């Protein structure tokens, strides 16, 4: 039975190749944290210790309202314990699968939050790591929160360049990923989806996708720019910020 200060560790929230994430609850106040436990022997055997450490150091410097906070790091001879901000609302894509597509203004509100967090990553994350849609969570206030907790590996109930075999620029792949997130928010499904795998890949490389009748031309053009197959032709975050659909009701705090 494990305690960090007043936090009693309980259920496992997520698990990955590198460790597990357990919810901690403050015995007095009920405050919750998410404790990422990294077993030294496992991360050594995967040869990822250097990458992970450099990730921890960078996360100390992150201050964005839609990216998971790191509160402290405890090091023992056998484990690292990263005490992080708790998120209660699960994965965004699970919410979309359960509840269907999101009303247009809510889609926009969430997407503005997500794109701001990605822009902050491109600006402040020293080594780039591709955004994974399964890392976009929802917090108690129905705000987007980017976190790497391995929720998607728990069971209860790619960009054209990624599949090209070539090295690529990470920030460009992130725009494509954000385009699928936006499409999913708006349509309740993925823009390229097919149970026949070669056809899924042909669809991703072909860049043609379905726009439901209920979406306006304006947002369709934004999605088209973000989902351009050729990165040389794809929207940047600046382009997206300038788009009339995205600009609507955009809080200034998101892009300072």
Curated annotation (Swiss-Prot):
It is found in: Cytoplasm; Nucleus. Transmembrane segments: none annotated. The active site is at residue 130. The modification Phosphothreonine is found at residue 236. ATP binds at residues 13-21, 36. Ubiquitinated. Dephosphorylated by protein phosphatase 2A and 2C (PP2A and PP2C). Phosphorylated by ULK1; leading to negatively regulate AMPK activity and suggesting the existence of a regulatory feedback loop between ULK1 and AMPK. Residues 7-246 form the Protein kinase domain. Changing residue 36 to R: Complete loss of kinase activity. It comes from the Eukaryota. Catalytic subunit of AMP-activated protein kinase (AMPK), an energy sensor protein kinase that plays a key role in regulating cellular energy metabolism. In response to reduction of intracellular ATP levels, AMPK activates energy-producing pathways and inhibits energy-consuming processes: inhibits protein, carbohydrate and lipid biosynthesis, as well as cell growth and proliferation. AMPK acts via direct phosphorylation of metabolic enzymes, and by longer-term effects via phosphorylation of transcription regulators. AMPK is a heterotrimer of an alpha catalytic subunit (PRKAA1 or PRKAA2), a beta (PRKAB1 or PRKAB2) and a gamma non-catalytic subunits (PRKAG1, PRKAG2 or PRKAG3). Interacts with FNIP1 and FNIP2. Associates with internalized insulin receptor/INSR complexes on Golgi/endosomal membranes; PRKAA2/AMPK2 together with ATIC and HACD3/PTPLAD1 is proposed to be part of a signaling network regulating INSR autophosphorylation and endocytosis. Interacts with ARF6. The AIS (autoinhibitory sequence) region shows some sequence similarity with the ubiquitin-associated domains and represses kinase activity. Belongs to the protein kinase superfamily. CAMK Ser/Thr protein kinase family. SNF1 subfamily. This is 5'-AMP-activated protein kinase catalytic subunit alpha-2. It comes from Homo sapiens (Human). The lineage of its organism: Eukaryota, Metazoa, Chordata, Craniata, Vertebrata. The chain holds residues 10 to 278 of 552 of the full protein.
């Amino acid at each position: 039975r494990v305690k960090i200060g007043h936090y009693v560790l309980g259920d496992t929230l997520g698990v990955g190749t590198f460790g597990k994430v357990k919810i901690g609850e403050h015995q007095l106040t009920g405050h919750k944290v998410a404790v990422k436990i990294l077993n030294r022997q496992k991360i050594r055997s995967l040869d990822v210790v250097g990458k992970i450490k450099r990730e921890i150091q960078n996360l100390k410097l992150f201050r964005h309202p839609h990216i998971i906070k790191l509160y402290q790091v405890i090091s023992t001879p056998t484990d690292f314990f990263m005490v992080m901000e708790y998120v209660s609302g699960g994965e965004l894509f699970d919410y979309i699968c359960k509840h269907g597509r999101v009303e247009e203004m809510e889609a926009r509100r969430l997407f503005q939050q997500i794109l701001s967090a990605v822009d902050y990553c491109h600006r402040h994350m020293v080594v780039h790591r591709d955004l994974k849609p399964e890392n976009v969570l929802l917090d108690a206030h129905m705000n987007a929160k980017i976190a790497d907790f391995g929720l998607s590996n728990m069971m209860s109930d790619a960009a054209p360049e990624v599949i090209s075999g070539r090295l690529y620029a990470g920030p460009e792949v992130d725009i494509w990923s954000c385009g699928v997130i936006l499409y999913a928010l708006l349509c309740g499904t993925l823009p390229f989806d097919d149970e026949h795998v070669p056809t899924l890949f042909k669809k991703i490389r072909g860049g043609v996708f379905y726009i439901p009748e209920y979406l306006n031309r304006s947002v369709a053009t934004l999605l088209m720019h973000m989902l351009q197959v050729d990165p040389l032709k794809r929207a940047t975050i600046k382009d997206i910020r300038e788009h009339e659909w995205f600009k609507q009701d955009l809080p200034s705090y998101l892009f300072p």
